[PDB]
Amino acid sequence: RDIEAENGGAGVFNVNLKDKYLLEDDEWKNDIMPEILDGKNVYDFLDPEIAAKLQALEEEEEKLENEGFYNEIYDGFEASEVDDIKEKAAWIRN
Amino acid sequence: MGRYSVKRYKTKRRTRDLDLIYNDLSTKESVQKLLNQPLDETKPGLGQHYCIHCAKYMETAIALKTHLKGKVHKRRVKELRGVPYTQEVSDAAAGYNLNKFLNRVQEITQSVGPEKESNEALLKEHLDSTL
Amino acid sequence: SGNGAQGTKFRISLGLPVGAIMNCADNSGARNLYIIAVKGSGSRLNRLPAASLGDMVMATVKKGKPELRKKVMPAIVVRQAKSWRRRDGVFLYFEDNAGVIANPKGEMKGSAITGPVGKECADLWPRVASNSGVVV
Amino acid sequence: SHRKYEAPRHGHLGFLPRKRAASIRARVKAFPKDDRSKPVALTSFLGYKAGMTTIVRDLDRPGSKFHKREVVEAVTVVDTPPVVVVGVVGYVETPRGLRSLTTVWAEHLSDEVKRRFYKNWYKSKKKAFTKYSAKYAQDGAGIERELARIKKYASVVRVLVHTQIRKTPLAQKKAHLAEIQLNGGSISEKVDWAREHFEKTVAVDSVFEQNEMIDAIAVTKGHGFEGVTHRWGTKKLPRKTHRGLRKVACIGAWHPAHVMWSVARAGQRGYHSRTSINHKIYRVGKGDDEANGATSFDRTKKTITPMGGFVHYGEIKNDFIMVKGCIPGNRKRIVTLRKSLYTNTSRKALEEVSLKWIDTASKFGKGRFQTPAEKHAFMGTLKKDL
Amino acid sequence: AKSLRASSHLNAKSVKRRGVFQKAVDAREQRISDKLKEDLLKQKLEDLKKKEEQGISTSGWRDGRHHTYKKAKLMKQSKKKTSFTRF
Amino acid sequence: MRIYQCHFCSSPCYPGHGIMFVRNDAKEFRFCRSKCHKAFKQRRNPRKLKWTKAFRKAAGKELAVDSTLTFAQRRNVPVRYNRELVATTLKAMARIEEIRQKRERAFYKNRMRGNKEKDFLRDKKLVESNPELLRIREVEIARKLAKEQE
RNA sequence: GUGAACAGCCUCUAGUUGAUAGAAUAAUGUAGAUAAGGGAAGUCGGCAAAAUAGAUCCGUAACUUCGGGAUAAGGAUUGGC
RNA sequence: GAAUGUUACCGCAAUAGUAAUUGAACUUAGUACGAGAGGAACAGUUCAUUCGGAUAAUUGGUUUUUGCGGCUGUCUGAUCAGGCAUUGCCGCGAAGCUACCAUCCGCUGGAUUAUGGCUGAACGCCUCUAAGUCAGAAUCCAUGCUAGAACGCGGUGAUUUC
RNA sequence: UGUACAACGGGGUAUUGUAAGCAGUAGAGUAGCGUUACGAUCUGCUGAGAUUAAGCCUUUGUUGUCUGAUUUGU
Numbered sequence A: 001r002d003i004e005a006e007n008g009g010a011g012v013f014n015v016n017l018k019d020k021y022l023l024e025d026d027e028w029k030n031d032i033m034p035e036i037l038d039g040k041n042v043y044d045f046l047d048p049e050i051a052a053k054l055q056a057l058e059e060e061e062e063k064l065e066n067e068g069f070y071n072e073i074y075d076g077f078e079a080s081e082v083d084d085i086k087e088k089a090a091w092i093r094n
Numbered sequence B: 001m002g003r004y005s006v007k008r009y010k011t012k013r014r015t016r017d018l019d020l021i022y023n024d025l026s027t028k029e030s031v032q033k034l035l036n037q038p039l040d041e042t043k044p045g046l047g048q049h050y051c052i053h054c055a056k057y058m059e060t061a062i063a064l065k066t067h068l069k070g071k072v073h074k075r076r077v078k079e080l081r082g083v084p085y086t087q088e089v090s091d092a093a094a095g096y097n098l099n100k101f102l103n104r105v106q107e108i109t110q111s112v113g114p115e116k117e118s119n120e121a122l123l124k125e126h127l128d129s130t131l
Numbered sequence C: 001s002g003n004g005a006q007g008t009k010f011r012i013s014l015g016l017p018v019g020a021i022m023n024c025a026d027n028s029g030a031r032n033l034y035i036i037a038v039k040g041s042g043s044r045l046n047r048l049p050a051a052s053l054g055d056m057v058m059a060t061v062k063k064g065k066p067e068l069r070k071k072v073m074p075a076i077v078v079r080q081a082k083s084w085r086r087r088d089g090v091f092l093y094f095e096d097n098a099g100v101i102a103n104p105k106g107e108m109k110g111s112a113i114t115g116p117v118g119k120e121c122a123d124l125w126p127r128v129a130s131n132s133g134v135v136v
Numbered sequence D: 001s002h003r004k005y006e007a008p009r010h011g012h013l014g015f016l017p018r019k020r021a022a023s024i025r026a027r028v029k030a031f032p033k034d035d036r037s038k039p040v041a042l043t044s045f046l047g048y049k050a051g052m053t054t055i056v057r058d059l060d061r062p063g064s065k066f067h068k069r070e071v072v073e074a075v076t077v078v079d080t081p082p083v084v085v086v087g088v089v090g091y092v093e094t095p096r097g098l099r100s101l102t103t104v105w106a107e108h109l110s111d112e113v114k115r116r117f118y119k120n121w122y123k124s125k126k127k128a129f130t131k132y133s134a135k136y137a138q139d140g141a142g143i144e145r146e147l148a149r150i151k152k153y154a155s156v157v158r159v160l161v162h163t164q165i166r167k168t169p170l171a172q173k174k175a176h177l178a179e180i181q182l183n184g185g186s187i188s189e190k191v192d193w194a195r196e197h198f199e200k201t202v203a204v205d206s207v208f209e210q211n212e213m214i215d216a217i218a219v220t221k222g223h224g225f226e227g228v229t230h231r232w233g234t235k236k237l238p239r240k241t242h243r244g245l246r247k248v249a250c251i252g253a254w255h256p257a258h259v260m261w262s263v264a265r266a267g268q269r270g271y272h273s274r275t276s277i278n279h280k281i282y283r284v285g286k287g288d289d290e291a292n293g294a295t296s297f298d299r300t301k302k303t304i305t306p307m308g309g310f311v312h313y314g315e316i317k318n319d320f321i322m323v324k325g326c327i328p329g330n331r332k333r334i335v336t337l338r339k340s341l342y343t344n345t346s347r348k349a350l351e352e353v354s355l356k357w358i359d360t361a362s363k364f365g366k367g368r369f370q371t372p373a374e375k376h377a378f379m380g381t382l383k384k385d386l
Numbered sequence E: 001a002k003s004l005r006a007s008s009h010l011n012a013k014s015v016k017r018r019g020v021f022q023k024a025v026d027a028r029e030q031r032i033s034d035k036l037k038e039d040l041l042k043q044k045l046e047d048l049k050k051k052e053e054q055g056i057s058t059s060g061w062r063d064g065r066h067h068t069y070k071k072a073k074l075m076k077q078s079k080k081k082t083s084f085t086r087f
Numbered sequence F: 001m002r003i004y005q006c007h008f009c010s011s012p013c014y015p016g017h018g019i020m021f022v023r024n025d026a027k028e029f030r031f032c033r034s035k036c037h038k039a040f041k042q043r044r045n046p047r048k049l050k051w052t053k054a055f056r057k058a059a060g061k062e063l064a065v066d067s068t069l070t071f072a073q074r075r076n077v078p079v080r081y082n083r084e085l086v087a088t089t090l091k092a093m094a095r096i097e098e099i100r101q102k103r104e105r106a107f108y109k110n111r112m113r114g115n116k117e118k119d120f121l122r123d124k125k126l127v128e129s130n131p132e133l134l135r136i137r138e139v140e141i142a143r144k145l146a147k148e149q150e
Numbered sequence G: 001g002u003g004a005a006c007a008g009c010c011u012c013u014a015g016u017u018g019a020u021a022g023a024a025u026a027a028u029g030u031a032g033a034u035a036a037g038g039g040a041a042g043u044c045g046g047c048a049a050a051a052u053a054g055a056u057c058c059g060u061a062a063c064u065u066c067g068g069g070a071u072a073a074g075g076a077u078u079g080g081c
Numbered sequence H: 001g002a003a004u005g006u007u008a009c010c011g012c013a014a015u016a017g018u019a020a021u022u023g024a025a026c027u028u029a030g031u032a033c034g035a036g037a038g039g040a041a042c043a044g045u046u047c048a049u050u051c052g053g054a055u056a057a058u059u060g061g062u063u064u065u066u067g068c069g070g071c072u073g074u075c076u077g078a079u080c081a082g083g084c085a086u087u088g089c090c091g092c093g094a095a096g097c098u099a100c101c102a103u104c105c106g107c108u109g110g111a112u113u114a115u116g117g118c119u120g121a122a123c124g125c126c127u128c129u130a131a132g133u134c135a136g137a138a139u140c141c142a143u144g145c146u147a148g149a150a151c152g153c154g155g156u157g158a159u160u161u162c
Numbered sequence I: 001u002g003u004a005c006a007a008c009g010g011g012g013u014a015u016u017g018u019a020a021g022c023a024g025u026a027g028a029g030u031a032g033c034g035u036u037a038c039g040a041u042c043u044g045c046u047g048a049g050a051u052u053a054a055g056c057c058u059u060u061g062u063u064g065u066c067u068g069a070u071u072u073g074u
């Protein structure tokens, strides 16, 4: 109340709540915490060892890529023949 | 927007929710309490003859029997079969609290489900015997 | 903004004009409250005094104890079915209109409140917040 | 005899007559008082109203119930590309008021501002200012004499500027020309500033900045001929009243044997000049900023333009002013932004605005997504994508 | 309540107005003037870079057109007896 | 400030959008649109309405169980603010979203394989079943080619 | 054809396509609708509107000239296959 | 809306009108005052009542968008696609319009009244009054807001080749 | 005779709610000889299909259009 009275008084003084934070670094007190990123909430992704979790996800992704997860002719027909069949069927429908 | 839907689903004319009815039917104690109700002068039939599935009071036991022999009651009973669709289902569909949704689904499949089914069967045979 | 209310009140959409009937959410024996006046209401020709969430009204008990009936008592509105805007960014509403019986100092006659209580009313009245089990 | 129940009259008698405005550009009736000690500055600016959107603000207001809390507020976006200085006008004081003494124009004018002088541009030979431009030859005598006359005699100096309407999505090609008063040093300093700024552009951040209170001057949206009930707010007469219920039942019952000027009558609603004051600037956005719609809390790289663009307006590709609330006029209308006429003494004039989020969902419907990338991410793969 | 035109409220407003509000106004005006000068300098630099590729008595009449028009106007006013200041 | 998911259709609910309904048991129901709110008031089943994420997940139109879908959950135990942890989270969110989009694309491609075979069989059957129209087509093409030649 | 039905709605035979027209979509009207929350606080007065409605089953008070009251009241239901 | 050379742009302001209002809250403070019981205000801040002017980002209402879908009866042989039922009926419904059912905004200089004074005679006391003069009310006149004399005005651009 | 204008077309942005056609072993049962026939409905191709300026945004495409009449002088 003495600080408030010497600065602005009641209803004028704007106290900084971040001054009482017990952080690892005192330079982090006046840091703006992000909340939104591309339609997602940051707070429900925030977690320690998320680096390890993302590393495990990357290992799984590499395994899927190696296995081949992401990768015109029929029995008795050639590509030109099936193109002719498709073209004639489109003509018939029209 | 139209008058029929407006005057049926006004907020002051709202009915009890399906998940609440499922919670009522899941536990045997709740079913016993709803079957043995105190005499209330403000209720139809003095608070007796209460259909738990439809959450509806009848004036008489014959009215309750006719209600049980009907498609509206069958419609509600069919609606009360599966997962109750709480907010966790929509969160999981959006991709949020998926593990919590999976745990709830497996709990319903394992423990809550068959107990609710047995309670429903006992209620059905009790109503058939007494009516 | 009423005697016993803690601080100022920001404007809420009005849901309950004079003549409305709301449920009684306390355990004093009343079943419903019939609004006859709104405390702090303005003066305008032809305009009905109307209450909102957190407002103090004068109410008569229509259904309840015979000793409780046939008198006018102060009440506080704790639920309304008319949608109102919260400054955090959503419009919201309850199923019913409901209030609790209080004294002119804002103290509850009953000892507990059943059903949810609006944050505006609970923050405005300290005794409602003390007797509330569910706050939104 | 006397009226039994008192009631305030319907409508404001100071906004009479309720007629159509003379011009679509509303006149600035007063400028801030000039202080000769201050540096040279413009007193107003021109913009085009684009639309409205929504923000979330982290409020710092001691004594308020919403102190240290979030509030959702509506804002108006005004597209403000830089204006171009093309002239200067000197005003002397007379017992009959302010009188314009002389006007000096720049040597080169663009077709945008030349079109303001024509009713049929495509058929004209485009001869405007073609002989005036010849007075700049051989050291500019005449131009120098008129500038010296303004320095010697004028008590008020105004600068003639015009909008760069080609930068907006507007279908109109004709620019808007207006006088903006110069408040600053001496008359000679104002004249020197105007002369050195001929054919130069002034941007909106060299007139206003963030957290400043400004005034909006514009013509309201027209509504045509209107009855008394919605023109003045009178109560409707009971059902099936003879000769209509959307009327005043008795326009006169007393001695003067006339209809009083203070009685509500049917007529024109809207399209009036209006000056509203004390609108706080929430953002001064730069048009070359790739993320002028992003905040420190919201890391999404996006601009101010909503999905699908502003309805009936288009995209915002220039500097913009985001003020809170609403201003008179409709979308795509020219508006004048004026400096405050007095030193505001409210704490809201000293508050610093920090925005946490800016809404960029589509205004063409119930917009659910902020970006097309977000919409694609939510929906997934469509039939035509495969 | 005290009106908007109440003398004591206006006096207190003036006392407040002479302080922090006027100081903030002055600081904003200085910043805006600096930005305006920077904008003019940037336009000058862009014009110089563009040109790199390519490379007093006020007495009497204003002009002859003004002299002829004003003399004809005054002669017409004298002839038609429609002058504001001259019989 | 938080992005909520619609109770009916799981669409994102941004601040100042939609409407909330509070029940007697303190359950909040947020709806992104009046459409979803009115469907809920009419007591329709979102697992029966096809345009909802609940229906799509139940019917298998899009993948529902994956490693990239377990990174988002409500955090009821807060952690102390850490600048490097925040930066790592901000990069991880982008990486997770990119991987999830790739897997969703793969799931849809696996679901839609076989369509080319079905369309080819339908086209072949139509061509076999319409001989006379094919003769008309041949006559028209021959007349057009003769016109081009002369 | 639907339906208890010469009801209302649609159709076949037969007969009409007549009644000054065109362009725009201000106020006020004439005729017809919808509306959040509350529910007669409106008004001399619930004026006007709204609500009810067919059919099957259960059930139905005072009073009474014993014939009635009575469709009293109050409830459950209705599609398709 | 004719006319005073024509035509165009930017302005001035005679005159006329004029608008804001009330309550509560924090602090001052459980302080002055008071045996006690009780209990203020100025300065500094925050909301709300009534009124007024706008505005449609959001929420709500509205639907001939006859936009999408569905239902009854009949009719076009059936499917498909459709007609009619004086907008057939039911659900959603953009755009537009709109709501204290939604949101925003609404000021500051001179002169005064009652009254309190200063100097000071009348009247060798005295006296705010006689001459002179200081302050002082939601009052007055302005600032600010609306219109702009169609017979008030200024500055500026262009001014015809048969 | 051009960041020219228009009529279409394209891409976005929105509204609704999954088109027509084909197929299945899903379908209470019933009839004939495990099969076949009928069968409300269910499922897949299919957030499909339809509409989207008439006062939405945008546009390297296609096709065209650019013209008559009257009056005015210090």
Ligand SMILES: [Mg+2]
Pocket (backbone or CB within 6 Å): C045, C046
């Ligand atoms: Mg009255």
Ligand SMILES: [Mg+2]
Pocket (backbone or CB within 6 Å): none
């Ligand atoms: Mg209004």
Ligand SMILES: [Mg+2]
Pocket (backbone or CB within 6 Å): D311, D363, D364, D365
């Ligand atoms: Mg919109």
Ligand SMILES: [Mg+2]
Pocket (backbone or CB within 6 Å): G035
């Ligand atoms: Mg209503």
Ligand SMILES: [Mg+2]
Pocket (backbone or CB within 6 Å): none
């Ligand atoms: Mg009455």
Ligand SMILES: [Mg+2]
Pocket (backbone or CB within 6 Å): none
């Ligand atoms: Mg009355």
Ligand SMILES: [Mg+2]
Pocket (backbone or CB within 6 Å): G072
């Ligand atoms: Mg009777």
Ligand SMILES: [Mg+2]
Pocket (backbone or CB within 6 Å): none
């Ligand atoms: Mg004070």
Ligand SMILES: [Mg+2]
Pocket (backbone or CB within 6 Å): none
């Ligand atoms: Mg039909």
Ligand SMILES: [Mg+2]
Pocket (backbone or CB within 6 Å): H120
């Ligand atoms: Mg004296």
Ligand SMILES: [Mg+2]
Pocket (backbone or CB within 6 Å): H149
């Ligand atoms: Mg005039």
Ligand SMILES: [Zn+2]
Pocket (backbone or CB within 6 Å): B051, B052, B053, B054, B055, B067, B068, B072, B073, B076
């Ligand atoms: Zn039932």
Ligand SMILES: [Zn+2]
Pocket (backbone or CB within 6 Å): F006, F007, F008, F009, F010, F011, F031, F032, F033, F036
């Ligand atoms: Zn939704």
